């Protein structure tokens, strides 16, 4: 199991503009394409995105290399971020995982603001971390997504992937 693998699970994958949790325009494997209400500037997102007339429908290969800019974009975000980067840094592999697959989600600055979470994660208090997660809106509003990440937080192992 991999990042790539993890979040094509949380995410999955629609070539048609659909709207995320949250009421938003997006398309592929969780590509937000914006906030706005209009589909028509969703479309046009999608167009300079994929570089063609898309008309609202893209291609798995076209899903693909949105996705990999993304997963780039979440990474260079944490190692660019100066309260992101060192708890990163102190993580095992999977566990970094799981942090990777919040920023994805919710941007590097939503995560920076888990400033308990990541002090416990640092310190690696995994339980007492795993509890502070929780305590959120996040958890709440995505709670299936919210405890498989959670649990590979508590755990470093992919337990939580398996038999998806
Ligand atoms: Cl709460
Ligand atoms: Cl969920």
Not at 62 to 89: C, H, M, S, T, W
Request: charge should be positive; hydrophobic fraction near 40%; glycine fraction near 8%.
């Amino acid at each position: 199991m991999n990042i790539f693998e993890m979040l094509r699970i949380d995410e999955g994958l629609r070539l048609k503009i659909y709207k995320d949790t949250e009421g938003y325009y997006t398309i592929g494997i969780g590509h937000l394409l914006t906030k706005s209400p209009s589909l028509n500037a969703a479309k046009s997102e999608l167009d300079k995105a994929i570089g063609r007339n898309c008309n609202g429908v893209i291609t798995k290969d076209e899903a693909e290399k949105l996705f990999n800019q993304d997963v780039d974009a979440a990474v260079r975000g944490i190692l660019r971020n100066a309260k992101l980067k060192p708890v990163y840094d102190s993580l095992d592999a999977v566990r970094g995982c799981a942090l990777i697959n919040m920023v994805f989600q919710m941007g590097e600055t939503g995560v920076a603001g888990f400033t308990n979470s990541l002090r416990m994660l640092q310190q690696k208090r995994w339980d007492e971390a795993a509890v502070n997660l929780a305590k959120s809106r996040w958890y709440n509003q995505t709670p299936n997504r919210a405890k498989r990440v959670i649990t590979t937080f508590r755990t470093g192992t992919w337990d939580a992937y398996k038999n998806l």
